[PDB]
């Protein structure tokens, strides 16, 4: 029953200070309760703070103790969303599987396509932060490689071209991302590539589909 001026409970502060002992203590009996899900003023939960810190062990303890994984902080970000922008691969691993439970699953999957207020799902973030490793992870976890972001319909492949991430582009390409998709304006991943300074990208796409674009010079005004 304690809150900081910023809304952080003992649990929040246990992770902020990184007190595995006290965190272990807290989770002693708070496990299986909504205490775990309390949000400070930034709308963050202990799990959220754990993700940001990149502490895989911490993330597992909370997750194992029944911590809600789909809770959203002020940016609509889920713990996993936070992990993709911090490159916390191992935390992602902890979360991207069934919750821990000894010899005393579609649920952990729901995290895969949850989206923040930027219309981004974990994958969108991963690809934007050119986090190739996080892409392999999400791809293997089964994330929608074609899912368009809402501001203009950009797909992972579109985001990969905007980031000029070749390894990412290629990973997405070999995984089966449709190189035919176009954003609200009609532009396709190959088309955007041509308007970018990295030749490798166009070649990669050429080698996996290469449907040559149109033109319509931005349809001038």
């Amino acid at each position: 029953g304690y809150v900081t001026e910023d809304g952080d409970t003992a649990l929040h502060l246990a992770v902020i200070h990184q007190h595995e002992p006290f965190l272990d203590f807290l989770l002693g009996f708070s496990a299986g309760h909504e205490y775990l899900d309390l949000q400070n003023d930034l709308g963050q939960t202990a799990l959220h703070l754990a993700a940001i810190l990149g502490e895989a062990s911490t993330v597992e303890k909370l997750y194992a103790a029944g911590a809600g994984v789909l809770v959203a902080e002020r940016g609509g970000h889920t713990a996993l969303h936070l992990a993709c922008r911090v490159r916390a691969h191992t935390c992602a691993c902890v979360l991207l599987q069934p919750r821990p439970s000894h010899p005393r699953d579609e649920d952990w999957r729901l995290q895969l396509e949850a989206e923040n207020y930027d219309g981004h799902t974990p994958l969108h973030v991963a690809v934007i932060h050119k986090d190739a490793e996080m892409v392999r992870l999400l791809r293997d976890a089964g994330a929608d490689l074609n899912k368009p972001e809402p501001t203009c319909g950009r797909t992972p492949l579109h985001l990969a071209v905007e980031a000029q991430a070749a390894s990412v582009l290629e990973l997405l390409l070999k995984a089966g991302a449709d190189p035919t998709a176009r954003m609200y304006g009609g532009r396709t991943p190959l088309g955007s590539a041509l308007l970018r300074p990295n030749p490798i990208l166009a070649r990669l796409l050429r080698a996996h589909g290469a449907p040559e674009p149109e033109d319509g010079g931005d349809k001038l005004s």
């Binding site: 029953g1 909504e34 205490y35 309390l38 003023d41 609509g76 207020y117 219309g119 809402p150 203009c152």
Partner: protein
């Protein structure tokens, strides 16, 4: 008769209270004959802007209409699209989500959970 199309927008979410300034890039429109139509089951509303807010008939800066429910307690998906009053033509709908909003910005209620439900 041309075609209504929403090319890009800066954000696809906002407060269920409305008032969020949205920047929308589109295909050529007619400033005196166009609007931003928001829709959900049994619900319609339009963005607020004036002809002055229609840049080169290729972009519109308007503000979102408040949602039907102000005490919204969970994200709500709705539709947003360009509309011509002249022929009632519409553009391909686009996604928009209304979100709950800091009720009187008071944790006295958020803490009557962090202490009550604690």
């Amino acid at each position: 008769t041309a075609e209504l199309k929403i090319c890009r927008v800066n954000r696809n979410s906002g407060s269920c209270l409305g008032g969020d300034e949205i920047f929308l890039l589109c295909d050529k429109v007619q400033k005196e004959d166009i609007e931003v139509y928001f829709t959900g089951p049994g619900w319609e509303a339009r963005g607020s802007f004036s002809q002055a807010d229609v840049h080169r008939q290729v972009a519109i800066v308007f503000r979102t209409p408040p949602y039907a429910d102000p005490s919204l307690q969970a994200p709500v998906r709705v539709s947003m699209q360009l509309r011509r009053p002249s022929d009632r033509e519409l553009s391909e709908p686009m996604e928009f989500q209304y979100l709950p909003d800091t009720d009187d910005r008071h944790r006295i209620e958020e803490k009557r959970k962090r202490t009550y439900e604690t």
